[PDB]
Amino acid sequence: SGSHMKTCVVEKIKQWIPTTEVGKILGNRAAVKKHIERQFNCVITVHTEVQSSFGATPVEIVAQNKEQCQEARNAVMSLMQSHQDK
């Protein structure tokens, strides 16, 4: 704190994924989620304690900038850093 330009402010994004692929993020100690956090310096938080009428589970993202938050957001929509099975 007390920086001449740095702040505690951070970016945020939120999206839903069907429960049929939550295992593509949390299938092993969330090591796949932690790989996306090291790939974009972002942070990610799945919320399996939540479920919409869509039956899907939501997830959230945090980063220093949208230039780092959007790259982690667009990765989970198709690559998931574990979708190599297809």
Helix (H), strand (E), coil (C) string for the chain: CCCCCCCCCCEEEEEEECHHHCHHHHCCCCHHHHHHHHHHCCEEEECCCCCCCCCCEEEEEEECCHHHHHHHHCCCCCCCCCHHHC
What total of structural domains would you count in the chain?
Answer: 1
Domain that holds residue 85: 1-86
Beta partners for residue 11, in sequence order:
63
Of the candidates 50, 52, 34, 54, the residue with the CA atom closest to the CA atom of residue 42:
34
The method of structure determination was NMR
Q: Which residues contact 57 (CB under 8 A, 6 or more apart)?
A: 16, 17, 18, 19, 22, 46, 47, 48, 50, 51
- Supply the Cα-derived Rg of the chain in whole angstroms: 14
Q: How far apart are CA 50 and CA 55, in angstroms?
A: 9
